[PDB]
Amino acid sequence: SASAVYVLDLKGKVLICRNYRGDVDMSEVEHFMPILMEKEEEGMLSPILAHGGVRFMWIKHNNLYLVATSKKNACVSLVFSFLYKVVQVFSEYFKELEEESIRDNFVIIYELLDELMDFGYPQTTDSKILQEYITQEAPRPPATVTNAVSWRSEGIKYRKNEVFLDVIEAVNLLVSANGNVLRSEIVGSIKMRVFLSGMPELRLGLNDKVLFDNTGRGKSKSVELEDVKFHQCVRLSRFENDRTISFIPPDGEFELMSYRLNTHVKPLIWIESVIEKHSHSRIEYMVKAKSQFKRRSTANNVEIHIPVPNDADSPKFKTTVGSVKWVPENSEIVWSVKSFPGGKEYLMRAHFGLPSVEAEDKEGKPPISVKFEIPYFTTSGIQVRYLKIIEKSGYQALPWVRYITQNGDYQLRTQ
Template sequence: VSANGSVLRSEIVGSIKLKVVLSGMPELRLGLNDKVLFEITGREKSKAVELEDVKFHQCVRLSRFENDRTISFIPPDGESELMSYRLNTTVKPLIWIESMIEKFSHSRVEIKVKARSQFKSRSTANNVSIMVPVPSDADSPKFKTSTGSAKWVPEKSAVLWTIKSFPGGKEYVMRAHFGLPSVESDELEAKRPITVDFEIPYFTVSGIQVRYLKIIEKSGYQALPWVRYITQSGDYQLRTN
């Protein structure tokens, strides 16, 4: 994200992971809201997603997928990645960051960072960490936060603001005060971006949905499929002025 708030580059990289505890070697079929499949079958496409760069685990029958987009497989036991995909989609930042840096008489600097969640209130981002770069010669840090905690990370010349739980539709503020040496360096520092990390359980920014997970077995095989969605921040950087 640029310093003026426009999204410079964004994409969604996703995967479907399995944790399998089944007896025998039953065949499974997975149904997604795949745009190409919906076009083939004449379904409503408004809630379909267009998957790109799809890569499958070796257990998936590729010929079947290429023929009619059916994801059919005999899964290995335990944990594995069934497939990965990419969506070349412009996504607004789920946690929006604004920062303002103000210097006072070459001896003090104040940084104000505002964080706003841009998703619905029924979802919550967990373990949010916001790394804010500061001048490398700053010292004597003091912090004030409306929620969470802030700490000075001198080896990275940055402030780390952590928020354990960040509900949707909320806005929080962190203020940091630093002293600066009385003799100012003539060398200009490269402006480093703010970085943000978080995860949102039971939430999918891509819009991908598991429509069904079926066990194809003649003998009345009993099993309980369970699906969990999670969104992680990936590489999220915001340039500063």
């Protein structure tokens, strides 16, 4: 129940404001900047502010914080969802999120803001559907918004029917400084770029453990996805009944399902690092990386971030494979490896100086983060079984899908 959604700037200037209910005066935005400064300077800064009887709940974007005023006990989750939808719509319409487009695309921005939410209740949020009613360069609204199918515009015709899938894996490992991994979860990401003619009803079928058990094939490699988050086009009832993944794919790239299950296997990369930091004299980095992944897979663009001293200077790197560069902006040693064959072992011996005078305050121990991304590797073992592309007219589809394995929250706790 937001009262007025406004877009601010980095200097406190409101780039654009659009009141929806008017229950909050527009002058209350002036106290938002001082309130945010006080909260940040006292550690009380939060995404949801409070200017007396009016709360300013908003998030910070690339260049501005979208503050949406509210007065009643409105759904903060609803406000956050509306803000996320607005950010996605702006990103779809404008390739960049900065003040350069706010002051240049106001004509279409105002129309989009007026059409998106009325009286604090959003009604239309599909960027592809919204692009047919509001343009920056007006006919009747499309029937898709009024119709039940608001994610598949009718009348789409293409020369070919090719759908590109992307099974993106995120290897997140929370390894403590003692050497034990605490948070080791892998979240699947099935992003598909459907480009066909018409409104096909996709019939997704994979090697799920639950599906195999129900059908009686619970003996082969089946993915035990703890959480499966279907998209809007996917029918929740069909999945709830017999794990039937039936949905109408949209035109473009979108996320259909997002698997998320815990991981109990060995890490793909094992890093053994040592810290021979002398007391204001020198420092040693005996870092050894062991690739526990399969030898048939190669981790393209391996970036193991090793946090070096903040005041360290005159560093020397004695490694084996991969480019080692120290970034003063990040204050860490970037163990950059182009191609890392599975089972490879890289040994590094760091040596950097340190000032004699001790630092005034402690800087902490940032964790070591690996940026390995090995494509064509399905760690979870989940394989797509079939994709029932059915169209009323009748056509032969050519679906495609690729599996990409990367490291997510794969950080290693420092000692």
